[PDB]
C-alpha cells in the first residue's frame, strides 16, 4: 500500500511543513516501486534529498539502496512523465510537487513510454 493511502492529508502536509521548518534545504520525497515491474523492492520510501541534486544523482542513491547491479535498467517516473537524469530535483519538485508538499516518484525496470 502507498504512503498516500496510509496517512491522511493533514498528517502528510503536517510532515512536509515540519521538514520545511527544520530542513529548508531538503526536498521531501516519497520513492516507491512501480506496479508492473519485477525490479527489486525498496526497504524505505521516505527521503530527504539535498536540494541541489540532479535526478541522476538521486537515481544513483536509489540504485544503491535496492542493490541494483550496474548493468540493470531503472526509470524514475514523476506525474506520468520521465524526467531526464540531467534535470534538477529542485525543478522537478517545483513542477510536480503534490498538494501535500511531498514529491512523489515511482521507479521501474520498464520504460512505459517505449
Amino acid at each position: 500500500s502507498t504512503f498516500k493511502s496510509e496517512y491522511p492529508f493533514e498528517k502528510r502536509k503536517a510532515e512536509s511543513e515540519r521538514i520545511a521548518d527544520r530542513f529548508p534545504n531538503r526536498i521531501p520525497v516519497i520513492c516507491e516501486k512501480a506496479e508492473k515491474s519485477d525490479i527489486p523492492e525498496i526497504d524505505k520510501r521516505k527521503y530527504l534529498v539535498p536540494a541541489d541534486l540532479t535526478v541522476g544523482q538521486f537515481v544513483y542513491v536509489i540504485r544503491k539502496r535496492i542493490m541494483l547491479p550496474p548493468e540493470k535498467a531503472i526509470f524514475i517516473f514523476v506525474n506520468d512523465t520521465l524526467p531526464p537524469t540531467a534535470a534538477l530535483m529542485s525543478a522537478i519538485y517545483q513542477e510536480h510537487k503534490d498538494k501535500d508538499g511531498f514529491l512523489y516518484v515511482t521507479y521501474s525496470g520498464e520504460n512505459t513510454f517505449g
Binding site: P8, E10, A14, I19, K44, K46, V61, K64
Partner: peptide, 22 residues
Amino acid sequence: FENVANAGSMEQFETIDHKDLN
C-alpha cells in the same frame, strides 16, 4: 485517520548526504 494530525515522523525519513554520491 481519526484525530488531529501531528507532524511526527514515526516512519523516519532517510537522509541522503552528498557523500553518499562518492
